[PDB]
């Protein structure tokens, strides 16, 4: 038995509203790397199966991720915590995004979606996102101080999605609003926000975009997705709507929280910040993602009995891959608790473990991170925090809602 308080639940949103449970994860890696996380009736975050297996070692996370034939994303979705009284149908509706599908449905969709994340398509966004990163930093600097999350972290990830999809500038304001309103629904600051209605408006806008491109096909990603190839595979209008919802959801808070927590790490380690401003190493992005681990945990469901590192996982049981624990696995990383922007190799699982569902936007995220921190170094090299950050109440997402900083220093 690990040295934990009785009834500790690693998906408890009340934990992450206050802290990352780093020491509790380290105790599991030390005394029980695969530990049954029991859950009382009605306190399962929408799941009523009694609990889950906490997966805390990077090797075990990687094994689950590559064995998608056994560990299903579709059965219960990949998000391990919602509001306790969520209806089952609201969990299953997530199966319309490819993140919560299994093969062969997932395989078909990913093949089509791959057209949109080719090195070409992502690389073609570099110039506009650099210009936007410089403009964001310059505006924050001119403001002198403010909420780093809103003034520096929030916009560039949304502009990457907008620039990727070819969204007209006049529409990006409401698009960003809908994308942000699907967020942090478990936090009291956003308790009055309806993520269902926001998704419907995203789907409506996306489907109209697909209808415009059906009559006006140009050379852009959206056309390539809604244009049938030789084998006739393509995104239907509604599937494109679900793809945009996925991007607006997947490519938003995660990159944002990487930027905020990366700057928090720089503030806590000024020697690393001084090093970054001089050298600007591209390895910084991956260490920032390891340190930030924006997705604390995703889950899978065992479709058959499976033995994982001497532990018998039974059919139907959930496994929760705690990336936050794996990214600080003492047996994998040299000095895991050291923030080292020059860390290489850096085999973190912040983008998930290698497998069918590995983050398709990983290189877009790295580019966004590298560009915004170059802009921060260019325009506010002496920025200093004003007060402590406010964390997001979530059982699986690692979010910073607000962080007051002084750009002038
Ligand atoms: C630092 C930023 C990001 C982090 C930490 C992150 C993390 C993740 C994780 C953990 C997964 C699941 C891996 C698995 O289940 O094995 C994933 C998948 C995915 N990500 Fe990201 N992500 C980030 C940025 C982005 C961006 C910028 C985009 C798109 C613009 C994106 C789009 C997706 C999609 C579509 C999937 C589903 C892939 C599939 O199911 O086949 N992500 N991401
Ligand atoms: N801020 C949220 O809550 C939320 C954030 C988020 C991020 C991803 C993701 C990130 C990176 N790579 C792949 C996926 C997936 C789901 C995410 N979500 C769930 C929100 N979603 C709202 C409506 N109800 C169901 C849950
Ligand atoms: Cl194996
Ligand atoms: Cl928001
Ligand atoms: Cl990996």
Residue numbers in the entry: 19 to 427
Recite the paper's sentences.
These sidechain‐modifying reactions are catalysed by the cytochromes P450 CYP125A1 and CYP142A1 (CYP125 and CYP142 hereafter). Comparison of the effect of complementing a CYP125 knockout in the CDC1551 strain of Mtb (which does not express the CYP142 protein), with CYP125 or CYP142 reveals that the two enzymes are functionally redundant with respect to growth on cholesterol. Here we present a series of compounds based on an ethyl 5‐(pyridin‐4‐yl)‐1H‐indole‐2‐carboxylate pharmacophore which bind strongly to both Mtb cholesterol oxidases CYP125 and CYP142.
The replacement of the cyclohexyl group with a piperazine ring, 14, showed a significant drop in affinity. The introduction of the amide group on the 2‐position of the indole 15 rescued some affinity however with both CYP125 and CYP142 these were both greater than 1 μM. In the X‐ray co‐crystal structures of compounds 14 and 15 in complex with CYP125, the pyridine coordinates directly with the heme iron, but in an orientation that is rotated almost exactly 180° around the heme vertical axis relative to compound 4.
